[PDB]
mmCIF file of C-alpha atoms and ligand atoms in Angstrom:
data_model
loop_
_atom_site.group_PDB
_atom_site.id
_atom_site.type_symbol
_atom_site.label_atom_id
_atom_site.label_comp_id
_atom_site.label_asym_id
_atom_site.label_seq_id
_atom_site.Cartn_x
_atom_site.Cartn_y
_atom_site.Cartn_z
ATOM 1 C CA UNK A 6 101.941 87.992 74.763
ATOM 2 C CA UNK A 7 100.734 87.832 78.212
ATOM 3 C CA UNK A 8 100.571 91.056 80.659
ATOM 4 C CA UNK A 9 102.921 91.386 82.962
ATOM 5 C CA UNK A 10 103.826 88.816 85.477
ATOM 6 C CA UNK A 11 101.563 85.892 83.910
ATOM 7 C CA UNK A 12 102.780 82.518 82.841
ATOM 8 C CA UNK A 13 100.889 79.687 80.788
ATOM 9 C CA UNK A 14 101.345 76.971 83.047
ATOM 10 C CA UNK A 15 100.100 73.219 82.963
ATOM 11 C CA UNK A 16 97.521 71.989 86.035
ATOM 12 C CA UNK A 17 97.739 68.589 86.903
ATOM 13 C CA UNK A 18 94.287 68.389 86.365
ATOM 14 C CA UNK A 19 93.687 66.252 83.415
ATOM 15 C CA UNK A 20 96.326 67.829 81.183
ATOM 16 C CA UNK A 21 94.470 71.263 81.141
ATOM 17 C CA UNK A 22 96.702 74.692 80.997
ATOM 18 C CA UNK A 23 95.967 77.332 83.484
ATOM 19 C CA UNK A 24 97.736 80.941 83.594
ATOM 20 C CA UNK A 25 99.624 82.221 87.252
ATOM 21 C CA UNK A 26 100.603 85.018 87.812
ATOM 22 C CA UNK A 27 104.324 85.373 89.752
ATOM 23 C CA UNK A 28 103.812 88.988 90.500
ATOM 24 C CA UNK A 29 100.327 88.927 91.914
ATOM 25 C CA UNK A 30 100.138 85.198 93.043
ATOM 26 C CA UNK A 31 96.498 84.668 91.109
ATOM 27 C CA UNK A 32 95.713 81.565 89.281
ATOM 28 C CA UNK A 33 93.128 81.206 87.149
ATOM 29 C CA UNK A 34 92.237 79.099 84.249
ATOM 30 C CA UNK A 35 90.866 81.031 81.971
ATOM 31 C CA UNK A 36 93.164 83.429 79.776
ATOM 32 C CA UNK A 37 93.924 86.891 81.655
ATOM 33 C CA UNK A 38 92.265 89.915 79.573
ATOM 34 C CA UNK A 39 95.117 92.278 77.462
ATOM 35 C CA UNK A 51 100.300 101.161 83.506
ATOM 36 C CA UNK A 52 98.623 103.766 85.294
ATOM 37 C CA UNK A 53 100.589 106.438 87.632
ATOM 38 C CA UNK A 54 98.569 105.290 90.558
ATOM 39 C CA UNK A 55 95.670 102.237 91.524
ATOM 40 C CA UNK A 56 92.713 101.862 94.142
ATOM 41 C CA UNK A 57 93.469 99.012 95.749
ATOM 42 C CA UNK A 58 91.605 97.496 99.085
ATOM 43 C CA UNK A 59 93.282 94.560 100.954
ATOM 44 C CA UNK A 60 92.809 91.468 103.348
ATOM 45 C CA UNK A 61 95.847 91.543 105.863
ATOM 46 C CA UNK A 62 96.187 88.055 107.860
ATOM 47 C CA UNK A 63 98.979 88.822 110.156
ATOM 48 C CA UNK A 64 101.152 85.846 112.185
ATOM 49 C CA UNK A 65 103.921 85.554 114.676
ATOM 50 C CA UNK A 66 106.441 86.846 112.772
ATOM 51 C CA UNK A 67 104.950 90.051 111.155
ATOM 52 C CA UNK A 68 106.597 93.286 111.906
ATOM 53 C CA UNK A 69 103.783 94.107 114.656
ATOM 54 C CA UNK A 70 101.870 90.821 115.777
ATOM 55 C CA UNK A 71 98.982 92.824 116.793
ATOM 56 C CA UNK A 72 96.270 94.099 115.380
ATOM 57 C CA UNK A 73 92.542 95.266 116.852
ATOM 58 C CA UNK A 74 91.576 91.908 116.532
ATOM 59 C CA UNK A 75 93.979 90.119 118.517
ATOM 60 C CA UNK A 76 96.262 92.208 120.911
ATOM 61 C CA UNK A 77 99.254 89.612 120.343
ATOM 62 C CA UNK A 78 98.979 87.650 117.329
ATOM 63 C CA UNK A 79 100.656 84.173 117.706
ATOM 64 C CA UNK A 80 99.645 82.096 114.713
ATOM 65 C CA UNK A 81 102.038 80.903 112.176
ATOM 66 C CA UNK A 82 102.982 81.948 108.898
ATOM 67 C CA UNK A 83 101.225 79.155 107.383
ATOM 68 C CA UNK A 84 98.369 79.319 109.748
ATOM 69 C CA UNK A 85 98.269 82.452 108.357
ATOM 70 C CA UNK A 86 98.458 81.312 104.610
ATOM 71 C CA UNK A 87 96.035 78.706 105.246
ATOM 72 C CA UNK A 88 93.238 81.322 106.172
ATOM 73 C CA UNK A 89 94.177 83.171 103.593
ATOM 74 C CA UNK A 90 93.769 80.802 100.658
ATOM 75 C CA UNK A 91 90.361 79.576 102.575
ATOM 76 C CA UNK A 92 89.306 83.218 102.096
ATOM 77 C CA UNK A 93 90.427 83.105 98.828
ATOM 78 C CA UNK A 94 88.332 79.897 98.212
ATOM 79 C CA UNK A 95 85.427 81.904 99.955
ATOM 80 C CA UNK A 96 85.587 84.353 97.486
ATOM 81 C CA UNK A 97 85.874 82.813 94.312
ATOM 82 C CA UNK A 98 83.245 80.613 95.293
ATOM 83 C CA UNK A 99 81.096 83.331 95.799
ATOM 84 C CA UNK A 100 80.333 82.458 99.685
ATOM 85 C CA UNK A 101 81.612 85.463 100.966
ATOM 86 C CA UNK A 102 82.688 88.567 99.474
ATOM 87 C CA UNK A 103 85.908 90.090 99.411
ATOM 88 C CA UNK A 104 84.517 93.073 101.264
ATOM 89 C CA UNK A 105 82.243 91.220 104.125
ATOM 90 C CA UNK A 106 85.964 88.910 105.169
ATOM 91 C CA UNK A 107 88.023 92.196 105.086
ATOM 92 C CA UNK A 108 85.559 93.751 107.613
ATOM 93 C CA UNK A 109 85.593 90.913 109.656
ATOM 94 C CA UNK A 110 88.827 89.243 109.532
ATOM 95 C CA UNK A 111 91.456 92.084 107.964
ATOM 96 C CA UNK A 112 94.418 92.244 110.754
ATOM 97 C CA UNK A 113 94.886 96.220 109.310
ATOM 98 C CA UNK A 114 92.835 99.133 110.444
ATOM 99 C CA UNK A 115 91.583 99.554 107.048
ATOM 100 C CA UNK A 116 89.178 96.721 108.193
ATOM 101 C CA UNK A 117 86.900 99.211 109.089
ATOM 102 C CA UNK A 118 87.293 100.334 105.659
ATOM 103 C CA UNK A 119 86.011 97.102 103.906
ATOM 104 C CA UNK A 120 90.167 97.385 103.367
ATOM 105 C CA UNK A 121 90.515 100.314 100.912
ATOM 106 C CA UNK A 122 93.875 101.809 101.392
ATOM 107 C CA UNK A 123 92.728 104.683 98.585
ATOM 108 C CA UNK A 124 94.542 105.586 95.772
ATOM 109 C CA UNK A 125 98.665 104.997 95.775
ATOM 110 C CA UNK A 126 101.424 105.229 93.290
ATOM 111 C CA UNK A 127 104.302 103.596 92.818
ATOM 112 C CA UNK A 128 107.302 104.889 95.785
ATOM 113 C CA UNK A 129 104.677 104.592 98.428
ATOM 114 C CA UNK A 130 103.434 101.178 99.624
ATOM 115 C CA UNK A 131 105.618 98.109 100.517
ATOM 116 C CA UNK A 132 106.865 97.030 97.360
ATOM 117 C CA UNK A 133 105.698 93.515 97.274
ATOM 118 C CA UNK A 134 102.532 95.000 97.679
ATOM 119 C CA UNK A 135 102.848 97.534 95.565
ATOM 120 C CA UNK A 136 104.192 95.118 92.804
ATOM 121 C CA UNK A 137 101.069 92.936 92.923
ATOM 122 C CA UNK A 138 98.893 95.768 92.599
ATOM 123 C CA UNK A 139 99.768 97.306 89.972
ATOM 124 C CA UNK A 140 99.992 94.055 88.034
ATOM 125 C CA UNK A 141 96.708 93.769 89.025
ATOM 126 C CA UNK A 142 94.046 95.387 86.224
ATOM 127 C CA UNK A 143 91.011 96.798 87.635
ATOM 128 C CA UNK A 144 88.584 94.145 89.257
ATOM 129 C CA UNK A 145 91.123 91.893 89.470
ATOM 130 C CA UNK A 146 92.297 90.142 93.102
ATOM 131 C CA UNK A 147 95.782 88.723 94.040
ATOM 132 C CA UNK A 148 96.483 85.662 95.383
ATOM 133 C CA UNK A 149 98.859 85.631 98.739
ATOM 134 C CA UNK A 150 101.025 88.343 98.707
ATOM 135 C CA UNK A 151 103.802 88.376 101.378
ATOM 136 C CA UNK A 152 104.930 91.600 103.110
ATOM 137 C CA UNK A 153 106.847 91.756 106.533
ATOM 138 C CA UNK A 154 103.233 93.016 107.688
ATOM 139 C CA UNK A 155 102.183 89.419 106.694
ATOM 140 C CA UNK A 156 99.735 88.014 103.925
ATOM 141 C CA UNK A 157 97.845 89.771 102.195
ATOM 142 C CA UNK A 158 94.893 89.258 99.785
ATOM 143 C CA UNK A 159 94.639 92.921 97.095
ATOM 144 C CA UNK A 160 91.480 93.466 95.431
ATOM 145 C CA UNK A 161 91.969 96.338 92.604
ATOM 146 C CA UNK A 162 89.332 97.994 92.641
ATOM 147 C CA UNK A 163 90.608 101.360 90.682
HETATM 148 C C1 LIG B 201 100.174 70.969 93.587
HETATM 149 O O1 LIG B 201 99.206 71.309 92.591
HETATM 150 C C2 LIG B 201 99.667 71.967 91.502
HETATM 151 C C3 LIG B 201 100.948 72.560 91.327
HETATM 152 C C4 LIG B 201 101.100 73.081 90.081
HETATM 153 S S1 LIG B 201 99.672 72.951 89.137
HETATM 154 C C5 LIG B 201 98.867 72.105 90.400
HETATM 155 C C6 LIG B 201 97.504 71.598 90.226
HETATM 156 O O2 LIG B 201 97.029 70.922 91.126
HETATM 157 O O3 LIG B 201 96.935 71.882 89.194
HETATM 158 C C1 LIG B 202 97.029 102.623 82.203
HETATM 159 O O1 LIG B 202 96.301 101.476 81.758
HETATM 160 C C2 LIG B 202 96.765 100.258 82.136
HETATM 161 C C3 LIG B 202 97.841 99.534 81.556
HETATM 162 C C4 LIG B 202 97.958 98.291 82.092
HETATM 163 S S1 LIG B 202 96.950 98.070 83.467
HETATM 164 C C5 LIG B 202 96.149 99.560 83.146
HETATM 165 C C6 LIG B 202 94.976 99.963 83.937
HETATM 166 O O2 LIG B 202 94.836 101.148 84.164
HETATM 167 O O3 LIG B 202 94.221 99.090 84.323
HETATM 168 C C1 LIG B 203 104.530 74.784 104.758
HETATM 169 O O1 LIG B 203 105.392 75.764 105.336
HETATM 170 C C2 LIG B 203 104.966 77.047 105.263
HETATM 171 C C3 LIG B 203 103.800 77.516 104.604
HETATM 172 C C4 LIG B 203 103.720 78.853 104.614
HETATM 173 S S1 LIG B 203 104.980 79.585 105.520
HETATM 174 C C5 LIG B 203 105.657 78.052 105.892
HETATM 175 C C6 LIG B 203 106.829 77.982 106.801
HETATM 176 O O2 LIG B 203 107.433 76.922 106.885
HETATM 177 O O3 LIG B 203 107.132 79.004 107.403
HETATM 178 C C1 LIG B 204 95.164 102.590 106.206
HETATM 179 O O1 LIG B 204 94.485 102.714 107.458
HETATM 180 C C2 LIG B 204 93.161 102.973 107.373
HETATM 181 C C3 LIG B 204 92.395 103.063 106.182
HETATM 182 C C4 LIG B 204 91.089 103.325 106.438
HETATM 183 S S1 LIG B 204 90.759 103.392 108.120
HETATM 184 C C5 LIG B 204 92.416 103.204 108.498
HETATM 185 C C6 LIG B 204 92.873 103.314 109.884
HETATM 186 O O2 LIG B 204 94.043 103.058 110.099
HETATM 187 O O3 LIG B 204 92.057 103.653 110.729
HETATM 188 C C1 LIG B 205 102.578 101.643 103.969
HETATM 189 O O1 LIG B 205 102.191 100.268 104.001
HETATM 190 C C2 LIG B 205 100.875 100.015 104.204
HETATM 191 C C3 LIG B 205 99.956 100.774 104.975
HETATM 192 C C4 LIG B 205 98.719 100.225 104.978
HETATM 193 S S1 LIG B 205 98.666 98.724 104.144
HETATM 194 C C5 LIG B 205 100.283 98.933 103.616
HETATM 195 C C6 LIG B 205 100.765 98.011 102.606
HETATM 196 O O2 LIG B 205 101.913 98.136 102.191
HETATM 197 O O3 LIG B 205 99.953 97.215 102.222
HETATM 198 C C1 LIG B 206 107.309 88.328 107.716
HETATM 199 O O1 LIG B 206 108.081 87.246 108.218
HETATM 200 C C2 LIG B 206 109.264 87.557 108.807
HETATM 201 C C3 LIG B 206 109.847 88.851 108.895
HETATM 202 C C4 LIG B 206 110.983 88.854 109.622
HETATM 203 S S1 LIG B 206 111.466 87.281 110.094
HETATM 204 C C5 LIG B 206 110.034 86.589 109.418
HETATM 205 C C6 LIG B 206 109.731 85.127 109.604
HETATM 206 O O2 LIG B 206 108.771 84.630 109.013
HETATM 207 O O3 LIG B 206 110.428 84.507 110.373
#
């Protein structure tokens, strides 16, 4: 079987499978490899006009949209997986939480703690691994699993 929250799914590029995960929001085509009381996680937080505070110590009001927001998030994603930038160097720079400053590690969390789509995603996530967009009412987030 498949761990937890991945599908086999077909691409529409030339008839080739890829696996998604519905838990996390990663894609990926290669086959996913293979849970703990608590994970390391850090995290890329895009915020937008309708998170629960539009503000962050970036931008004192926030205005963009929700898919403004998911648009820079899946060009960071691109970022990363291309190997342009790294998870950590976008955090620092672009994260709308305070864990910027951080290179986005929240520390260690177990389950009962975090928002749960959050906390979902990362603890589908297996060490190393990075979500795709994952919607809180913070906004979108991008979890690297680091522990
Ligand atoms: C819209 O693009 C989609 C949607 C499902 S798979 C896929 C692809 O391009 O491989
Ligand atoms: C406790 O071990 C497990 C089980 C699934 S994920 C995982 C991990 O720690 O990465
Ligand atoms: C394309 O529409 C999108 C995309 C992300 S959120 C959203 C909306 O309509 O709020
Ligand atoms: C979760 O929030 C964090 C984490 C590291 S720094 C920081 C802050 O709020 O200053
Ligand atoms: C408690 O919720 C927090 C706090 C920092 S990030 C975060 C999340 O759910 O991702
Ligand atoms: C996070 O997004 C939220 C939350 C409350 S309403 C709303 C929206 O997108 O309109």
């Amino acid at each position: 079987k498949l761990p937890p929250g991945w599908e086999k799914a077909m691409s529409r590029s030339s008839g080739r499978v890829y696996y998604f995960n519905h838990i996390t929001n990663a894609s990926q085509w290669e086959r996913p490899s293979g849970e703990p009381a608590r994970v390391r996680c850090s995290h890329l937080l895009v915020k937008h006009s309708q998170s629960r505070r539009p503000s962050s110590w970036r931008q004192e009001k926030i205005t963009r949209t929700k898919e403004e927001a998911l648009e820079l998030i899946n060009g960071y994603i691109q970022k990363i997986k291309s190997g342009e930038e790294d998870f950590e160097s976008l955090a620092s720079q672009f994260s709308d939480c305070s864990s910027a400053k951080a290179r986005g590690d929240l520390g260690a969390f177990s389950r009962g703690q975090m928002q749960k789509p959050f906390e979902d995603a990362s603890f589908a996530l297996r060490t190393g691994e990075m979500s795709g967009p994952v919607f809180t009412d913070s906004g979108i987030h991008i979890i690297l699993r680091t522990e």
